RNA sequence: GCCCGGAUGGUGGAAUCGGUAGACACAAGGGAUUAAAUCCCUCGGCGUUCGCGCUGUGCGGGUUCAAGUCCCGCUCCGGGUACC
């Protein structure tokens, strides 16, 4: 009783309900099956899904459904990165609280994800704003504090705000070195992490300052140039600069100008530091290019060999000394710029003649012996600031006794619950505004608990591991369950997370490994960064000179003979400027609502277009015509199955009794199976895999369907096609598999395997070239020798008119 | 300015660690059909006797029998970034 028309509104919600009733995608830690952990970055509950979520999650679902078909035990989890700033403002504007707003958004977006047919294990679903989740990061933060990895300090955000830090710098070498294990991670992401880590090898040099109580220590990556140091430079916010700023209004003004935010700017402090090797006095200047946060907040200036110092000394008349020769051993030309390149020393006394590595070592060694030097490794990577002065976050489990002592919240008081029934005044966090909230009792003593909450990247740093044991009440992780599934096989997300989430979850993994929780070094094997979804963008210039962005749907376009947009207007008469394909946005007004598209064409059409239009890691250009083309293709697949099943049951296929035509058509079915298998599994080229299925569908629509063996071959092809399309379009394929009388549910059906005997080509095509230009195309047996292929090539008349040989492919003959 | 990318028909894209350039789809133009929609052929440019011939992967070069693919440049494009 198959329907003639393909109507997704009659197929999809029934097929989705079936997946919920049968718990089809719910998995456990089954040791008899090879596991596969396919993860996609968890969504933030903003209210509605965007095309970027649809692309990310379709990619993940294609892999999870295919890996299942190969007989693997697949974990495809989903959850909600539910804490965050956008709930705080939306609660105020909508006269509600961040919690019911978030839970309403989770419920609406969850329905949207189900309407897309993503095969998630919904029993492992998590909301990171529930105490059942954040209680484990609170307990883990108390353990890190006891391990010496957590400290508090006032840092600059400009306001100096006291913050909680986790020492990520204690793991920097490992984060850096373990990038060489990440062969299935993109080079871009790895480069961004190497650069963001910024490992640096140098020397700390300490100086004595005349009429100043403390010493002054600088950090240098070029100690070889120490004899060409003519002055020192400190940050504006540096202690020495602030001491001198009292008897200096010129310096006091500069420090304030710096605080109230590539040109150089500086004021001489008036302090004189003594060069440890010459005993000479050099001035100490306050500089704008020196960061207080990096190293010691002070540098040694060698204007002759550092370009920042060159421009600083040239502007302020400071001394520029040459101490490094140019590559050819000649003295450098410092009249226009600094000599940056590393080389042999001169004007360096006992250090003359030493090459770069020898000069670096000898000067570092000499100073180290004198007590005024020591090698130091610094990192651009700053410690992880994890606290926020915001309400909608997980409470920090730290307390301050009346004693003045600071300690973690005791285990028997965990979790520190964030109250959800609150009224937001927009100005202050309800847990800060109510003075009684922070008043607690710890170790029998009155205490004030932390009112700052964790930043949301704390919950996203370990969610991937919590999906392995989401209802485990005895700890953060069940090591047995975690190690069964971890590391993640493929993590699908965006490159925009390279140096934030993609680095924090690597660090968090190692902390868990070092706590005994996991037995692996890295959280994810392969990282697949999907590209942005693009849409056309138009704007008109208003009478006031303002740009008003118009949605492409609202643009009436005029095209040339070659279909390119030549002129465009809107229904109001405004002349539109087409800007091309760009990132979807609210500023550009060109966003496409995936819910509008799923209701218009069905989830399978939307799913298939996004996998077909472009390679997963490249940008996708949203085109209405391309989505309609995908819709038409699914209707052609439906039509071929409708007509085939309308002819009743089929006979058993006999490969031994096949016609020359019937065998060649079967060979194309099996060669397609092999290509689609390699494109989805090994290459991850879903577009070429869908193209191969479309090419085969074109052939099947031309094949005869009258005759026992024609109908039996068509049965083998339609059962294979429906299974190959299933990861992309699971709802239509679930239904078509039932119409074709396939065994069980297509979700539990095996992935089609190519019959090696069906793909034995008895002959091959040899392109015959003479001087590289193709002149002939011949057909020779696959078992033929080179002599047989050359004799047959010579027999061709056009070849005869006019020696490299590739078996079964090419034969080129250079003209002599 | 720096870093890392990228450049193939009218468009998205294919050609998988050199060997038939443009698969597959969209757009367009013919065909069936009483406008839309769907189905069926044609389709890089130029020339053509309509058979095809010549050329063609941003621009120059190099290795090679052979380069879209590998290497060095120049131009244009894109994302990221801020004296560490
Ligand atoms: P990092 O490690 O990288 O760096 C270091 C350096 O820098 C400086 N500093 C220090 N500290 C500081 C702060 N705080 N801020 C700012 N800055 C700073 C110093 O300087 B040096 O080293 C160090 O020393 C010397 C004298 N000035 C020198 C020279 Br003679 C030369 C050079 C230098 O430095 C530079 C480096 C930077 N960068 C890395 C560069 C580059 C970039 C890109 C490309 C290439 C290169 C110095």
Coarse structural class: alpha+beta
What is the first-to-last residue Cα distance? 70 Å
**Total domain modules:** 5
Got a strand count? Answer: 32
Largest sheet: 7 strands, mixed
**CATH secondary-structure class of the largest domain:** Alpha Beta
Give the helix level as a range of percent: 25-40%
Radius of gyration: 34 Å
Morphology call: globular
CATH fold assignment of the largest domain: Rossmann fold
Bound molecules: ligand 7RZ
Spell out the CATH superfamily of the largest domain: HUPs
Estimate the strand proportion: 15-25%
CATH architectural grouping of the largest domain: 3-Layer(aba) Sandwich
Number of discrete helical segments = 24
Structure, described:
It is found in: Cytoplasm. With 816 residues, this protein is of the alpha+beta class. It folds into five domains: 2-199 and 379-535, Rossmann fold; 200-378, Isoleucyl-tRNA Synthetase, domain 2, CATH 3.90.740; 536-584, Rubrerythrin, domain 2 (Single Sheet), CATH 2.20.28; 585-761, Orthogonal Bundle (Isoleucyl-tRNA Synthetase, Domain 1); 762-816, Ubiquitin-like (UB roll) (Roll), CATH 3.10.20.590. Helix content is 35%, strand content 20%. The protein contains 24 helices and 32 strands. Strands 7, 8, 9, 10, 11, 12 and 13 form a seven-stranded mixed beta sheet that branches. It has a four-stranded parallel beta sheet with strand order 2-1-21-22, covered by helices on one side. The longest helix is centred in the C-terminal third of the chain and has 24 residues, at 660-683. The termini are far apart. The relative contact order is 0.11. Ligand 7RZ binds next to strand 7, strand 8 and strand 12. The protein binds one RNA strand of 84 nucleotides through helix 7, strand 28, helix 18, helix 19 and helix 20.
């Amino acid at each position: 009783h198959m329907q003639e028309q393909y109507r997704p509104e009659e197929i999809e919600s029934k097929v989705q309900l079936h997946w919920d009733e049968k718990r089809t995608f719910e998995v456990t830690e089954d040791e008899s099956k090879e596991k596969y952990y396919c993860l996609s970055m968890l969504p933030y509950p903003s209210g509605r899904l965007h095309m970027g979520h649809v692309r990310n999650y379709t990619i993940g679902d294609v892999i999870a459904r295919y890996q299942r078909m190969l007989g693997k035990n697949v974990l495809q989890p989903i959850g909600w990165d539910a804490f965050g700033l956008p709930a705080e403002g939306a609660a105020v504007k909508n006269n509600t609280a961040p919690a019911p707003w978030t839970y309403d958004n989770i419920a609406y977006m969850k329905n949207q994800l189900k309407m897309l047919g993503f095969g998630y294990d919904w029993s492992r679903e998590l909301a990171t704003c529930t105490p059942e989740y954040y209680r484990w990061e609170q307990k883990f933060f108390t353990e890190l504090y006891k391990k010496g990895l957590v400290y508090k300090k006032t840092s600059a955000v400009r306001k100096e705000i006291p913050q909680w830090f986790i020492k990520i710098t204690a793991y920097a070498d490992e984060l850096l070195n373990d990038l060489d294990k990440l062969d299935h991670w993109p080079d871009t992401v790895k480069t961004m992490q190497r650069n963001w880590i910024g490992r640096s090898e140098g020397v700390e040099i300490t100086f004595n300052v005349n009429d100043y109580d403390n010493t002054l220590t600088v950090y240098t990556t070029r100690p070889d140039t120490f004899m060409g140091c003519t002055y020192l430079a400190v940050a504006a916010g540096h202690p020495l600069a602030q001491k001198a700023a009292e008897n200096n209004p010129e310096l006091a003004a500069f420090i304030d100008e710096c605080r109230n935010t590539m040109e150089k700017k500086g004021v001489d402090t008036g302090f004189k530091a003594v060069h440890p090797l010459t005993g000479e006095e050099i001035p100490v200047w306050a500089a704008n290019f020196v960061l207080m946060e990096y190293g010691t907040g002070a540098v040694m200036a060698v204007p002759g060999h550092d370009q920042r110092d060159y421009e600083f000394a040239s502007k302020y008349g400071l001394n520029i000394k040459p101490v490094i020769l140019a590559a050819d051993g000649s003295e450098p030309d410092l009249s226009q710029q600094a000599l940056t390149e590393k080389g042999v020393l001169f004007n360096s006394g006992e250090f003359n003649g030493l090459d770069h590595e020898a000069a670096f070592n000898a000067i570092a060694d000499k100073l180290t012996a004198m007590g005024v030097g020591e090698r130091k490794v610094n990192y651009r990577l700053r410690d992880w600031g994890v606290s926020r002065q915001r309400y909608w976050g997980a409470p920090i489990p730290m307390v301050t006794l009346e004693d003045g002592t600071v300690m973690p919240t005791p285990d028997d008081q965990l979790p520190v619950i964030l109250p959800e029934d609150v009224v937001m005044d927009g100005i202050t966090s309800p847990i800060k505004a109510d003075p009684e909230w922070a008043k607690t009792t710890v170790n029998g003593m009155p205490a004030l608990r932390e009112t700052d909450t964790f930043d949301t990247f704390m919950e996203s740093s370990w969610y991937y591991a919590r999906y392995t044991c989401p209802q485990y009440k005895e700890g953060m992780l069940d090591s047995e369950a975690a190690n069964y599934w971890l590391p993640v096989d493929i993590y699908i997300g965006g490159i925009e997370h390279a140096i934030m989430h993609l680095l924090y979850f690597r660090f968090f993994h190692k902390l868990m490994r070092d706590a005994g929780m996991v037995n692996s070094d890295e959280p994810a094997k392969q990282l697949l960064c999907q590209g942005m979804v693009l849409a056309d963008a138009f704007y008109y210039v208003g009478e006031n000179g303002e740009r008003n962005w118009v949605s492409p749907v609202d643009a009436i376009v005029e095209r040339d003979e070659k279909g390119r947009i030549v002129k465009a207007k809107d229904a109001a008469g405004h002349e539109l400027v087409y800007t091309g394909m760009s990132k979807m946005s609210k500023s550009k007004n060109n966003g496409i609502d995936p819910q509008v598209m799923v209701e218009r064409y069905g989830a399978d059409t939307v799913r298939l277009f996004m996998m077909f239009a472009s390679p997963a890691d490249m940008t996708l250009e949203w085109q209405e015509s391309g989505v309609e083309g995908a819709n038409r293709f699914l209707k052609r697949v439906w039509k071929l199955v409708y007509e085939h099943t309308a002819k009743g049951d089929v006979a058993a296929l006999n490969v031994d009794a096949l016609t020359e035509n019937q065998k060649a058509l079967r060979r194309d079915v099996h060669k397609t199976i092999a290509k689609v298998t390699d494109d989805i599994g090994r290459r991850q080229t879903f577009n070429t895999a869908i193209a191969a299925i479309m090419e085969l569908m074109n052939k099947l629509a031309k094949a005869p369907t009258d005759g026992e063996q024609d109908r039996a071959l068509m049965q083998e092809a339609l059962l294979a096609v429906v299974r190959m399309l299933n990861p992309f379009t699971p709802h239509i394929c679930f239904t078509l598999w039932q119409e074709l009388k396939g065994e069980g549910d297509i979700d539990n059906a095996p992935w089609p395997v190519a019959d090696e005997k069906a793909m034995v080509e008895d002959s091959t095509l040899v392109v015959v070239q003479v001087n590289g230009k193709v002149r002939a195309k011949i057909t020779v047996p696959v078992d033929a020798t080179e002599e047989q292929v050359r004799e047959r090539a010579g027999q061709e008349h056009l070849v005869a008119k006019y020696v490299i040989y590739v078996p079964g492919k090419l034969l080129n003959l250079v003209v002599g």
